[PDB]
Design a protein around this ligand. Sequence first.
Ligand SMILES: CCCC(=O)SCCNC(=O)CCNC(=O)[C@H](O)C(C)(C)COP(=O)(O)OP(=O)(O)OC[C@H]1O[C@@H](n2cnc3c(N)ncnc32)[C@H](O)[C@@H]1OP(=O)(O)O
Length: 1053
Amino acid sequence: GPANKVRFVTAASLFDGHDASINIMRRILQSQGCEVIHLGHNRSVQEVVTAALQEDVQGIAISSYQGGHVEYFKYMIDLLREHGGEHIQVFGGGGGVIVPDEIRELQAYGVARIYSPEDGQRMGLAGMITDMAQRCDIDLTRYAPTTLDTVVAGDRRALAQLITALENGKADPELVSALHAQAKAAAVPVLGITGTGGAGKSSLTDELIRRFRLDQDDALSIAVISIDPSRRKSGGALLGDRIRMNAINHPNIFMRSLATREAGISQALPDVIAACKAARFDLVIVETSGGDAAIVPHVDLSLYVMTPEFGAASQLEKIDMLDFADFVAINKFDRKGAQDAWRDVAKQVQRNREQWHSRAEDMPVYGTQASRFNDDGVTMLYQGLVGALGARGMSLKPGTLPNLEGRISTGQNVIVPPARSRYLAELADTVRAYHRRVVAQSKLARERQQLRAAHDMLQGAGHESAALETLASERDVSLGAVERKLLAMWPQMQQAYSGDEYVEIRTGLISTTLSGTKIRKVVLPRFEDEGEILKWLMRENVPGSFPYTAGVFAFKREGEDPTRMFAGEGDAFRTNRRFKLVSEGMEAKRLSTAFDSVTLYGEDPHERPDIYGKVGNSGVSIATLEDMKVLYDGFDLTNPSTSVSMTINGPAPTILAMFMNTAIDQQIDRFRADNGRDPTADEEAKIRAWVLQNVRGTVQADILKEDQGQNTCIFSTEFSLKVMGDIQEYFVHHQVRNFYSVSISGYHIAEAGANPISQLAFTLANGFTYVEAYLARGMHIDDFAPNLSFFFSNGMDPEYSVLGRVARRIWAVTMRDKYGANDRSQKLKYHIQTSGRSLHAQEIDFNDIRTTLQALIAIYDNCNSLHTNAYDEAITTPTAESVRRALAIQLIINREWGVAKCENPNQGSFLIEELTDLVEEAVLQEFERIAERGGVLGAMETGYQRGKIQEESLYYEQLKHDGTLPIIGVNTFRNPNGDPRSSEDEKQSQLHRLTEFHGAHQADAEAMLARLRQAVIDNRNVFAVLMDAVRVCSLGQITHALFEVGGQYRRNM
Ligand SMILES: CCCC(=O)SCCNC(=O)CCNC(=O)[C@H](O)C(C)(C)COP(=O)(O)OP(=O)(O)OC[C@H]1O[C@@H](n2cnc3c(N)ncnc32)[C@H](O)[C@@H]1OP(=O)(O)O
């Protein structure tokens, strides 16, 4: 532990989701005795600086892995000098993105240190943190004011420094007494908010502060004192209440996180409060963790916060806080037994107050749900607090908020009903039951054949025993209806695949080799045993037949390969050229779009250094519908041989609306060109409706994965799911049957370290959650199931070879048995991308070897779409030459490779069938573990997924570093000889195209945006409005509109 109390503010830069490294740095800082105010990811400079200034820290640690770091730090250094924080030292992350010329530049600008990857290897990760902590080991109490004149005047930076003095007991004794004297005469209300651990203390507080801002039109000056007993023996702590605060980013709001001993509230808080009271605030809010009623004698009003899980009704007779609390908030009122929790608590408070002459429903016990946007429950609690604070001497304007009455929150958008909690377990039983039938029916089919076989052998010998036939006849009825038809069609099935054509229409079955050998596309088994035949027909039928283990289609398509390559760079014009380069000479126009971090967060490009640096870098910059049209110019989106994939999650409904309008306008253009006249009202509507049906493509939009470790979500999970459903409803209404609403991904999960079994199980579980959610909404299974794309990562692990086939069978069986859906719904279609986790910077030429083997098993196992990574993936975005080597891997396997001429080469293999069985079972067991945690959503409350992933990640690293798990070129066979974005004009282009778009729709802008908000308030279809909104509004405008009526995502520690 250092001399002074070293405080830090840590965060990831704006639009930066790579918050994996900064969460490691804040651990080492914490362990070395530093109080860390962690801000999480996606933090603007204006945010980080405001935090640093209010907390009054010695140092700031910022990680930047999305680029644009130079403009970012320059902004922060500038903004810190302007608002009295030049003594605060800014540090750069361990990102190897920043070249030496930029490190030297920024350090010369004002940045304390930027640690090069060279410094990482030399000093060590703990070494860099130790250096950074020692630099910030300075006393900040000397910068504190000596007169209250500054603080009382309204200076918040002076207040922040004054507190640093008061907290360290280095303030003048005469100054302190004069401070309390000022506070006593100030007469300002102090609300205390205490509660049990993990009850939503900060979440509810933030929402309550938001209530204050909305109700009083940001007229109130609120100071927030967060108290966390994390301060260990080393002196280090973690102050993570600020990360959950979204409504504090405003000049009238001030927040200070205090780290107190885990044993003993020190005599510092009543001073800190007095300081805020003297700073002429309107209201001081003080919150604590796990409830400790050591805050009661220091506040005017106390608020006990709890969850419905309090145990038996007798436990409430032990809680001292229920005897003092002026208000009680039962937060997370969406949980089970919340209703009974309310009556138990309300009765207990009535008993404690001995108010038998009152109604239990009148008690200050509120059922709140801070997680739900604009929750009336929270508002009801707020209405109560105001009346209490108002009577206790506080000036308040008449409220603008709906002054509704009641005590409990009025329900919520129930995603997965508690009755369907065990849905994953039910599916596990569904599959296992199918297998037990396979075993039983197989034995029946075997015996039936054995009897009639032995019966015929007796007639050839002479003596006959018809008693054998009596037993065989019993087997005929014992065998199921579908099982019997399977064996019946088997000889006929063999004749079909026997010929050279699959005879109406015909299809080639045989590809003749260079030697003259005939290679059958689909090779059928040669089993004599009818038990084996039935067993095979039920467990792994031919491609295109239930359970579609070897594929969902009969034969691989001649027109389109599974090839679909990831692209996206600079502005729409540049990517449009890269799209043509990849699909050069191919009838199969299969595009895969990647957006820049600015677009991925639903923002418009802007001059501000925060955003400007990010524009165009690492993905195409798409801000308006015009940009979208340029992106796919020339390409016929409605053409049957053209599918367009696009990677977007948060802003997915808006981007999809743009893509739809683009595809529609392409045909309106093609009509005005072919006829020379614009289509009439009836002609246009006929065209528009046709486009929606026949348009092919896929948008990712996996929201549940964004809270699984990616951390790139901008909207509240509940809101996104509502709009997600709005899209899926829209697809149904207009018969959009060629577009996939959500590409349920598991790639990001795998990159995080998850082994194949975990990746597959979680992804399927997530997919099943989306299914359960839509069913609870009221959609039919055959309406949304055929619109479900999947996304997996292929690594080197054995389980990857049988991943796709397992995913297909688990889906096909459950969809037919559990949900009773049609054939089109039982067919799981997925996209496989080779693993980037297996691609290393050490010996990059080896990566093509790994990417080949992964591509092979993907193609072997009849994947629906394949992306191949470049050999220099660990260093930069795929270059021009390097994207050809990636594309050649697919071309060589599909065209040159002989075994690939056969479309079911996996089938029959003893290894494949065993691995298929093993992996399938392992997934089912994982389904069960998640089910007994409340389903996927319930498990995410515990952070079960994120936890397991982080575990398996470290187990991989524990073996890779050790040498147990060999990696060629990395931990073995190391090389003796080998020791070791976006044009400025393009950024200006996007800015000009934006302001040009904005001026062109200035009249219809606000009108459309207001309509969009009202559609959320009136609980209408959001996507339906977006289909009109994107034609007069930009991405940023639409996103910001929804922020006001859908709320922003709240960060998790
Ligand atoms: C670090 C960041 C990494 C990332 O995020 S990368 C993610 C990017 N996303 C992707 O690469 C893939 C996107 N998803 C997709 O392309 C699709 O969802 C999918 C299902 C994988 C592929 O779709 P498509 O290739 O267009 O084909 P499809 O399965 O939708 O079906 C099209 C219709 O055409 C027909 N068809 C195509 N191939 C056939 C065949 N072999 N046999 C018989 N019929 C066939 C068929 O009619 C089918 O429609 P339907 O099955 O009758 O409803």
